[PDB]
Design a protein around this ligand. Structure first.
Ligand SMILES: O=P(O)(O)O[C@@H]1[C@H](O)[C@H](O)[C@@H](OP(=O)(O)O)[C@H](OP(=O)(O)O)[C@H]1O
Length: 119
């Protein structure tokens, strides 16, 4: 795995994805799976951000959905194809991340890659 898995190799490099929050709010955010295959670094532009706030554990993930499988994606990303969007659902209070991949290969890597680590 990891070194031999093409999805995980892609995630270790990181990707520029678009985070969907509303009709207007759709902004670029860089995500990158860390070498320990345990955490993900995420770009943030929050008023009071911090290095620890920009990491989240794979252990906090319930599932990763492909396609328009969330309200936010069903309402705000109609213009985006089914194969270029996905969502990361969390176990705790962390809000679900609705994401748009620059290409189907990217969405594939994230969904498949995270599913491999979660299971
Ligand atoms: O609306 P503003 O003032 O632009 O600020 C963003 C807004 O609060 C988003 O809801 C938030 O995403 P989450 O809901 O996922 O926190 C994003 O965080 P981010 O910068 O960490 O993506 C903020 O920057």
């Amino acid at each position: 795995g990891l070194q031999d898995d093409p999805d995980l190799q892609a995630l270790l490099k990181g990707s520029q994805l678009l985070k969907v929050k509303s009709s207007s709010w759709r902004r670029e955010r860089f995500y990158k799976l860390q070498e320990d295959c345990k955490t993900i670094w995420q770009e943030s532009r929050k008023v009071m951000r911090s290095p620890e706030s920009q990491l989240f554990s794979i252990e906090d993930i319930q599932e990763v959905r492909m396609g328009h499988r969330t309200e936010g994606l069903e309402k705000f990303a109609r213009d985006i194809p089914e194969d270029r969007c996905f969502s990361i659902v969390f176990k705790d209070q962390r809000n679900t991340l609705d994401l748009i991949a620059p290409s189907p290969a990217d969405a594939q890597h994230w969904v498949q890659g995270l599913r491999k680590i979660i299971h």
